[PDB]
């Protein structure tokens, strides 16, 4: 499906693509917001007449968006959620149009056995709901989050790039009765400035801050109590894509020492697609930032990557806005938000 | 600040690429299995363009066809393509005059000479240009410069020595020397016209050419006025310096990041290598710009498109890119070389630092080293090539041939040895 | 008399036992000190090249030079104030940069030598023989040992290799160079760099100066570098009486990673680096430096950017501390290349009682 | 101590005067013989030096 | 006179004197003909012979260890600075004497180092060694409750042979495939192993599958044991997990065949790490932790 049908009806797709390609848009939240806006635009302006055809068109659009940018998971996720929202309503409608038993909320045997309305408003409302959900995640985490950290315990923080994780930390630090020491890993080629900023923020907040280089993780590990990840995207089996540099090794270390590994992200970051390949989804950074000169640097081929992938075996906890979950359970949450056919587009 | 037109100086540096540029246009040729114009267009878009103007003369019909086929022809584009058709063979002065005669020039117009692809953001540069313009009434044009690889040694064609100021960023002297290639003239001259006004004199050589110009409305008028200036770098800048029109300013923008224009063959190769690596920050093939492209990223700087087939047990080195529809056999050693789209590679072939264009057949038991093969030119069984051997259009290298260092092969079916017909010159066959 | 007190930045809450302060710019000292020691101290304080191996050699050279320059006073004997001088030198060294195990060993050797020849012999005959003896010793226990190690390594390396390396350890550089030049095998070298000292960069430069295929990586980028790659080599500082690897910064993590991803690690060491001092953690005694090393924002050492950070004393409750010497786990390294060809790290003090 | 290049003093134990097998010893050598053997070696070297220039000049074996 | 011929002597018989001992005897015999007085005519020749033997080796490791031990012994011998005749005579005597010693060592092992299996401890035995078998048989003479578990060894059906040797003593036995070895660790108490050689690092040079077994033992915390006659210390260092000086191919990927011809080329020799050993039973005292390495150091004086 090409962009021959959408030219004067919807123009913003091109702009979105541009934003994606040259990285004019920054932060997954912003991307999600943009996607939502696009969806709204599609809904308010275009014509349908039929429902299945419309659904197909939407699917095609989603596919196109995916093809334009693979590292933008939030965009995909939101679309999927919207589709799911549509789908249930459609199913409900069909039952009235025609004019059923189930043990649970969803059935497996229903796939094997042979099975005009104001749905537009409902669809519109769905988008609004999604927006609302996106707006506040930290408020639904803090009631569970400020129960884990105790007095005279030491925290270790890889990936300070995420905006949620910092907030979570701050909320914990607010409490007068609670006291903890913070060890911060830098992350050289991608996270350094961000890490520094985080450290500064911590200092401002009036907490004991310890800036640790990437090599000095091993010596302090006898005192480490907990591990927190600043992840960017959540998946099916448990595996997560983290917000750039210095996460994997630390996680491995934690696993070795049997240190508890926590993860805070959200359900809008959660994807119903499987991360079958690390090489396909993980994007690599820039060689220019590491070392100067060009003519001797033709011989010196430098390897540097943005995003990081951590196996589900190391991570045990996934606290979101709903509540505390596991990597062995999060799949069901995704299913509760994205339907069966909506996985493949 | 908004609404800016673009004029691209295309079909200007023909015969500079001595084997090629005879049948097909210069810019239409692929950089990395995809045309060179596209990159330029993308760059322009990034900068901020509202209307596109291209200068065509040599094989213009093909260019027109390409434009028709291209994505910007459809109404979704913010910028439309309208080509300037001119009589054959003229200098950049004449072209400028022609442009002036037509009359589309408004405000701060963009003039780009050749094809350039770089990673640096342009909005900031534009802002700087605006601010500097706002300083004094008689400000002319912007020049782009980047820091070189510490010491210059691979630069012989254009090793321009830029004497620059730190406070104002303005050029004082321009000079070209063939000193590293041929030791005949090793001399540096300084003109005393601007010694007692600048004071802060910084003499530099290690700066690479970009040839991207942000130009005011004065420039075409100036060109019309002084018809002696045929070129834009050697005579023009110097003239400006030596006070042709009194009390005027020019820009020389300095950037720490990578920015190099396409000029020769080795330089082109280097650019390609850079592109393959992570030198350019957002410019990667896996993003897919032409929409027909289906490139994907893999470990150790390896690019693979969709429908790429590679057989088992083949040890690969560093930095390799493969185009769509390829069939590669067994026992191959591939190192720092790009393979074109729909190319059929045989068995037991050792490749090091080479370059392969679109749709090429590489024969069984052959060695390729640091040499380029153009589109639809085929290599036969047992061909041994050395460093810097350019092969032209549709050249059929058949069974058993050996070619020494820096051997150039003709493209059109004249003066240089080895022709387009059967067997390259070891036994005399051709037109 | 020297200089005392006045220390920059916060003292922090944790890890406070060893000296981290001191003379950087000289002001008022005793008028008897030979300047070569001072110069050496100045160098060591702001050094970016040295790593365990060459330091001791340098020290030895300095000592030899001192001996050559040494003149016996007309009144007192050859050893009366010499010991005092030595003590002063030691104190200066400690003030500048804490003494290593090799340095301690050297000091012990010197002391032994002093005891051996009693004050009775003339000046020009004694020191003639002393300097020669010391040279001979140097030839024996250091260079020859290194050569032996190299040769051992040579036979140990098989066909088709892909190696990840770390450090400014001279022996490793020698090894890699040897591989590149005289062996002519299919060697691939991958380099890891660290923040406190640009050792990896130096290694890379050295490799370039020979003409080797080089991949360049860091401590963070390790999850993608493996995805073919087999051997891992590290540079050791000293092995204790326990058997644990008491070495430089980013080694232990690398070793752990190697252990996780199937293939074990090999470490090289000399037959003099062994110590009788017992410790099992980095908290006991550690090389701690001024937080001036962790100021520069990436790229290169001399850049100086006014970005986000540039304050330590004015900041309320902020602890910016880094460690140089680490204690790696015992079981993780399997191969140890010493004076006795090949052996396990669990031997600990088999050479210490042997002397 | 020994390894490569350094001069070491030896005394002949057992000789097989038929094909070519020579047995040597270092422990039997006293401190007096050290200088002597070295001196002998030096003499030999000098002799060799003497019969080398001749070989060079007249171009004869 | 040949050592190879001597070696090819015993084949259907054996099952008594240790191999490394027979080789030593052969070496001694070779020596005591061409006058051991001269060191120039003899030691070099011995070395050459050893090299030849190494070249001729089909699939044997311990020979080298034996020969180097012999060499070391010889070196030790001429430190008395007495006379050439008496020392030579002593050396000559020390060949048959060495052979005699082996039996005594075995006896010592079978009487002292058999206390591990006492309170009906179920044994998992893999890797054929004579010493272990002797220990087992000698343990049945003291009427002590015990039980045996056999893991299937497949170089050329040695497992069957092993089960045939245990039937002579009349003792209940069962066969277990080395795939379901992970499933059964529950009732089986301790794991016992017979080794081809002990490495410089401490680890064990063995047969068709031992590393996996070791790993399993580690997982289960049920201790791993090695019982060998103390003369299998070779100057060899397995630096990585899959490297040894092997005569056979180290995992060779055979080309696409059709008639099913090239398949059986699986690893017939495997290596396990130094940490896996809990107790090593040898005649020269009950010593394990880093004892082999110490012995090596003592031998080479380095």
UniProtKB/Swiss-Prot annotation, chain A:
It is found in: Cytoplasm, Cytosol. Acts as a component of the translation initiation factor 2B (eIF2B) complex, which catalyzes the exchange of GDP for GTP on the eukaryotic initiation factor 2 (eIF2) complex gamma subunit. Its guanine nucleotide exchange factor activity is repressed when bound to eIF2 complex phosphorylated on the alpha subunit, thereby limiting the amount of methionyl-initiator methionine tRNA available to the ribosome and consequently global translation is repressed. It comes from the Eukaryota. Component of the translation initiation factor 2B (eIF2B) complex which is a heterodecamer of two sets of five different subunits: alpha, beta, gamma, delta and epsilon. Subunits alpha, beta and delta comprise a regulatory subcomplex and subunits epsilon and gamma comprise a catalytic subcomplex. Within the complex, the hexameric regulatory complex resides at the center, with the two heterodimeric catalytic subcomplexes bound on opposite sides. PANTHER family: TRANSLATION INITIATION FACTOR EIF-2B SUBUNIT BETA (PTHR45859:SF1). One of its GO terms (biological process) is regulation of translational initiation. The keyword Transport does not apply. This is Translation initiation factor eIF2B subunit beta. Present with 6650 molecules/cell in log phase SD medium. InterPro entries: eIF2B_beta_subunit, IF-2B-related, IF_2B-like_C, M1Pi_N, NagB/RpiA_transferase-like. The keyword Protein biosynthesis applies. Disulfide bonds: none annotated. Its main location: cytoplasm.
Curated annotation (Swiss-Prot), chain B:
GO terms for biological process: cytoplasmic translational initiation; regulation of translational initiation. GO terms for cellular component: cytoplasm; cytosol; eukaryotic translation initiation factor 2B complex; guanyl-nucleotide exchange factor complex. It comes from the Eukaryota. It is found in: Cytoplasm, Cytosol. Keywords: Cytoplasm, Initiation factor, Phosphoprotein, Protein biosynthesis, Translation regulation. Component of the translation initiation factor 2B (eIF2B) complex which is a heterodecamer of two sets of five different subunits: alpha, beta, gamma, delta and epsilon. Subunits alpha, beta and delta comprise a regulatory subcomplex and subunits epsilon and gamma comprise a catalytic subcomplex. Within the complex, the hexameric regulatory complex resides at the center, with the two heterodimeric catalytic subcomplexes bound on opposite sides. Acts as a catalytic component of the translation initiation factor 2B (eIF2B) complex, which catalyzes the exchange of GDP for GTP on eukaryotic initiation factor 2 (eIF2) and is regulated by phosphorylated eIF2. Its guanine nucleotide exchange factor activity is repressed when bound to eIF2 complex phosphorylated on the alpha subunit, thereby limiting the amount of methionyl-initiator methionine tRNA available to the ribosome and consequently global translation is repressed. The gene is GCD6.
Swiss-Prot record, chain C:
It is found in: Cytoplasm, Cytosol. One of its GO terms (biological process) is regulation of translational initiation. One of its GO terms (molecular function) is translation initiation factor activity. Residues 328-355 are annotated as: Disordered. Its main location: cytoplasm. It comes from the Eukaryota. Keywords: Acetylation, Cytoplasm, Initiation factor, Phosphoprotein, Protein biosynthesis, Repressor, Translation regulation. Residues 342-352 have a biased composition (Basic and acidic residues). Acts as a component of the translation initiation factor 2B (eIF2B) complex, which catalyzes the exchange of GDP for GTP on the eukaryotic initiation factor 2 (eIF2) complex gamma subunit. Its guanine nucleotide exchange factor activity is repressed when bound to eIF2 complex phosphorylated on the alpha subunit, thereby limiting the amount of methionyl-initiator methionine tRNA available to the ribosome and consequently global translation is repressed. Belongs to the eIF-2B alpha/beta/delta subunits family. Present with 10300 molecules/cell in log phase SD medium. This is Translation initiation factor eIF2B subunit delta.
Swiss-Prot record, chain D:
Changing residue 26 to A: Alters the binding mode to the eIF2B complex. Phosphorylation inhibits the guanine nucleotide exchange factor activity of the eIF2B complex. Changing residue 3 to A: Alters the binding mode to the eIF2B complex. It is found in: Cytoplasm, Cytosol. eIF-2 functions in the early steps of protein synthesis by forming a ternary complex with GTP and initiator tRNA. This complex binds to a 40S ribosomal subunit, followed by mRNA binding to form a 43S pre-initiation complex. Junction of the 60S ribosomal subunit to form the 80S initiation complex is preceded by hydrolysis of the GTP bound to eIF-2 and release of an eIF-2-GDP binary complex. In order for eIF-2 to recycle and catalyze another round of initiation, the GDP bound to eIF-2 must exchange with GTP by way of a reaction catalyzed by eIF2B. Belongs to the eIF-2-alpha family. Present with 17100 molecules/cell in log phase SD medium. Eukaryotic translation initiation factor 2 eIF2 is a heterotrimeric complex composed of an alpha, a beta and a gamma subunit. The factors eIF-1, eIF-2, eIF-3, TIF5/eIF-5 and methionyl-tRNAi form a multifactor complex (MFC) that may bind to the 40S ribosome. Interacts with CDC123; the interaction is direct. Interacts with GCD1. This is Eukaryotic translation initiation factor 2 subunit alpha. The chain holds residues 62 to 122 of 304 of the full protein.
């Amino acid at each position: 499906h090409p962009n021959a049908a959408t030219s004067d009806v919807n123009v913003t797709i091109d702009t979105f693509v541009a934003k994606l390609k040259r990285r004019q848009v920054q932060g997954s939240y912003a991307i999600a917001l943009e996607t939502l806006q696009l969806l709204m635009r599609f809904i308010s302006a275009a014509r349908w007449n039929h429902v299945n055809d419309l659904i197909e068109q939407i699917r095609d659009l989603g596919n196109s968006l995916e093809k334009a940018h693979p590292t933008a998971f939030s965009c995909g996720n939101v679309i999927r959620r919207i589709l799911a929202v549509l789908r249930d309503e459609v199913e409900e409608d069909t039952m009235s149009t025609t004019v059923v038993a189930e043990p649970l909320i969803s059935s497996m045997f229903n796939l094997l056995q042979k099975p005009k309305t104001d749905y537009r408003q409902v669809a519109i409302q769905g988008i609004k709901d999604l927006i609302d959900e996106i707006k506040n995640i930290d408020e639904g985490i803090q009631q569970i989050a400020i129960d884990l950290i105790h007095d005279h315990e030491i925290l270790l923080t890889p990936t300070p790039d995420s905006k949620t994780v910092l907030k979570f930390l701050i909320t914990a630090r607010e409490r007068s009765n609670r006291t903890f020491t913070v060890l911060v890993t830098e992350g050289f080629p991608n996270n350094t400035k961000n890490a520094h900023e985080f450290a500064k923020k911590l200092a401002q907040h009036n907490i004991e801050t310890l800036v640790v280089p990437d090599s000095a993780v091993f010596a302090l590990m006898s005192r480490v109590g907990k591990v927190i990840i600043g992840t960017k995207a959540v998946f099916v089996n448990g595996g997560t894509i983290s917000s750039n540099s210095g996460v994997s090794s630390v996680c491995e270390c934690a696993r070795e020492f049997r240190t508890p590994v926590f993860a805070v992200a959200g359900l809008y970051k959660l994807s119903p697609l499987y991360p079958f390949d690390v090489e396909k989804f993980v994007e690599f950074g820039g060689s220019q930032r590491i070392l100067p000169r060009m003519d001797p640097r033709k011989r010196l081929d430098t390897v540097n990557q943005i995003t990081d992938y951590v196996p589900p075996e190391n991570i045990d906890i996934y606290i979101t806005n709903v509540g505390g979950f596991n990597p062995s359970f999060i799949y069901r949450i995704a299913w509760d938000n994205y339907k069966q056919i909506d996985v493949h587009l | 600040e908004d609404r800016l037109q673009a004029v691209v100086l295309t079909d200007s540096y023909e015969t500079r690429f001595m084997p090629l540029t005879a049948v097909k246009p210069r810019c239409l040729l692929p950089l990395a299995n995809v045309p060179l114009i596209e990159y330029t267009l993308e760059f322009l878009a990034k900068a901020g363009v509202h209307e596109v103007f291209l200068i065509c003369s040599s094989h213009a019909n093909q260019i027109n066809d390409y434009i028709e086929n291209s994505k910007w022809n459809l109404p979704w584009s913010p910028f439309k393509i309208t080509t300037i058709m001119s009589p054959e063979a003229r200098c950049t002065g004449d072209v400028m005059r022609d442009l002036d005669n037509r009359g589309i020039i408004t405000g701060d117009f963009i003039l780009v000479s050749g094809d350039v692809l770089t990673n640096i953001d342009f909005s900031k540069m534009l802002e700087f240009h605006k601010k500097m313009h706002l300083q004094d009434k008689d400000h002319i044009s912007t020049m782009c410069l980047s820091k070189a690889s510490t010491y210059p040694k691979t630069r012989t064609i254009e090793p321009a020595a830029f004497v620059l100021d730190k406070s104002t960023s303005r050029c004082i002297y321009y000079q070209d020397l063939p000193l590293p290639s041929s030791r005949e003239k090793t001399s540096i001259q300084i003109d005393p016209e601007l010694l007692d006004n600048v004071d802060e004199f910084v003499i530099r050589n290690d700066l690479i050419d970009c040839r991207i110009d942000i130009c005011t409305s004065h420039v075409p008028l100036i060109f019309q006025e002084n018809f002696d200036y045929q070129s834009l770098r050697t005579d023009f800048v110097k003239g400006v310096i030596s006070s042709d029109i009194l009390g005027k300013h020019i820009y020389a923008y300095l950037t720490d990041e990578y920015a190099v224009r396409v000029e020769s063959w080795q330089t082109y190769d280097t650019i390609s290598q850079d592109f393959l690596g992570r030198w350019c920050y957002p410019l990667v093939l896996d993003s897919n710009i032409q929409d027909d492209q289906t490139y994907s990223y893999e470990s150790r700087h390896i690019y693979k498109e969709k429908d790429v087939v590679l057989a088992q047990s083949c040890k690969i080195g560093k930095c390799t890119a493969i185009g769509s529809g390829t069939k590669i056999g067994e026992g191959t050693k591939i190192e720092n070389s790009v393979i074109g789209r729909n190319c059929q590679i045989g068995e037991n072939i050792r490749i090091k630092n080479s370059f392969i264009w679109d749709d090429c057949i590489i024969g069984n038991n052959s060695i390729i080293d640091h040499s380029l093969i153009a589109s639809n030119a085929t290599l036969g069984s047992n061909v041994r090539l050395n460093d810097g051997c350019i092969i032209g259009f549709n050249v059929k290298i058949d069974d058993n041939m050996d070619l020494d260092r820096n051997t150039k092969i003709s493209a059109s079916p004249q003066d240089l040895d080895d022709q387009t017909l059967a067997v390259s010159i070891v036994g005399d066959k051709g037109v | 008399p020297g200089i005392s007190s006045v220390i920059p930045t916060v003292l922090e809450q944790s890890f406070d036992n060893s000296s981290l302060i001191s003379v950087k710019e000289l002001l008022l000292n005793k008028d008897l000190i030979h300047p070569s020691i001072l110069l050496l101290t100045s160098h060591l304080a702001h050094y970016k090249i040295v790593g365990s191996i060459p330091r001791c050699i340098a020290m030895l050279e300095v000592f030899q030079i001192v001996i050559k320059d040494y003149q016996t006073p007309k009144g007192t004997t050859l050893s009366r104030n010499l010991t005092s001088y030595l003590s002063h030198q030691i104190d200066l060294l400690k003030k500048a940069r804490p003494l290593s195990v090799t340095m301690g060993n050297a000091i012990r050797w010197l002391k032994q030598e002093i005891s051996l020849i009693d004050p009775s012999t003339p000046d020009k005959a004694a020191k003639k023989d002393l300097c020669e003896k010391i040279g001979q010793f140097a030839k024996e226990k250091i260079e020859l040992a290194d050569q032996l190690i190299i040769d051992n390594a040579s036979t140990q390396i098989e066909e088709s290799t892909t190696i990840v390396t770390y450090g400014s350890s001279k022996v490793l550089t020698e090894l890699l160079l040897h591989n590149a030049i005289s062996l002519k095998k299919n060697i691939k070298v991958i380099v890891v760099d660290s923040r406190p000292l640009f050792e990896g960069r130096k290694m890379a430069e050295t490799l370039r100066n020979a003409g080797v295929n080089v991949m360049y990586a860091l401590i963070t980028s390790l999850d993608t570098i493996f995805n073919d790659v087999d051997y891992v080599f590290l540079g050791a500082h000293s092995i204790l009486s326990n058997g644990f690897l008491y070495s430089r910064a980013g080694t232990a993590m690398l070793a752990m990673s190697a252990k996780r991803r199937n293939i074990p690690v090999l470490v090289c060491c000399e037959s003099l680096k062994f110590s009788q001092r017992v410790q099992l953690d980095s908290v006991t005694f550690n090389e701690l430096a001024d937080p001036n090393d962790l100021v520069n924002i990436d790229y290169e050492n001399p850049v100086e950017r006014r970005g986000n950070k540039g304050a330590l004393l004015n900041q309320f409750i902020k602890e910016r501390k880094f460690e140089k010497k680490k204690l790696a786990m015992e079981n993780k390294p399997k191969g140890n290349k010493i004076g006795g060809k090949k052996g396990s790290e669990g031997e600990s003090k088999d050479a210490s009682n042997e002397e | 101590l020994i390894r490569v290049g350094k001069n070491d003093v030896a005394v002949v134990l057992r000789v097989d005067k038929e094909k070519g097998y020579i047995d040597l010893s270092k422990r039997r050598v006293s401190s007096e013989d050290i200088i002597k053997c070295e001196e002998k070696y030096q003499k030999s070297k000098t002799v060799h030096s003497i019969l080398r220039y001749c070989a060079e000049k007249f171009q004869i074996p | 006179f040949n050592i190879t011929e001597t070696y090819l002597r015993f084949l259907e018989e054996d099952t008594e004197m240790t191999m490394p001992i027979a080789a030593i005897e052969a070496l001694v015999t070779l020596l005591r003909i061409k006058t051991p007085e001269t060191a120039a005519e003899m030691i070099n020749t011995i070395k050459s012979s050893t090299e030849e033997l190494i070249k001729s080796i089909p699939n044997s490791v311990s020979l080298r260890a034996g020969c180097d031990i012999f060499m070391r012994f010889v070196l030790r011998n001429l430190h008395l600075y007495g006379d050439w005749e008496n020392c030579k005579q002593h050396l000559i005597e020390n060949g048959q004497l060495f052979v005699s010693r082996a039996k005594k060592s075995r006896n010592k092992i079978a009487e002292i180092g058999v206390d591990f299996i006492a309170d009906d401890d179920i044994i998992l035995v893999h890797g054929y060694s004579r010493a272990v078998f002797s220990l087992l048989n000698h343990a049945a003479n003291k009427f002590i409750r015990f039980r045996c578990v056999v893991t299937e060894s497949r170089p050329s059906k040695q497992g069957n042979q092993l089960y045939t040797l245990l039937e002579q003593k009349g003792i209940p036995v069962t066969l277990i495939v080395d795939s379901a070895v992970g499933a059964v660790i529950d009732k089986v108490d301790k794991v016992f192993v017979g080794a081809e050689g002990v490495a410089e690092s401490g680890g064990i040079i063995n047969l068709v599958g031992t590393y996996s077994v070791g790993v399993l033992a580690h997982n289960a915390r049920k201790p791993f044991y090695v019982v060998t006659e103390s003369h299998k210390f070779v100057r060899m260092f397995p630096l990585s997990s899959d490297d040894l000086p092997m005569a056979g191919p180290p995992l060779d990927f055979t080309r696409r065949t059709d008639d099913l011809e090239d398949a059986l080329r699986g690893p017939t020799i495997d290596y396990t790490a130094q940490e896996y050993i809990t107790a090593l039973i040898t005649d020269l005292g009950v010593l394990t932790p880093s004892a082999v390495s110490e012995e090596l150091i003592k031998m080479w004086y380095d």
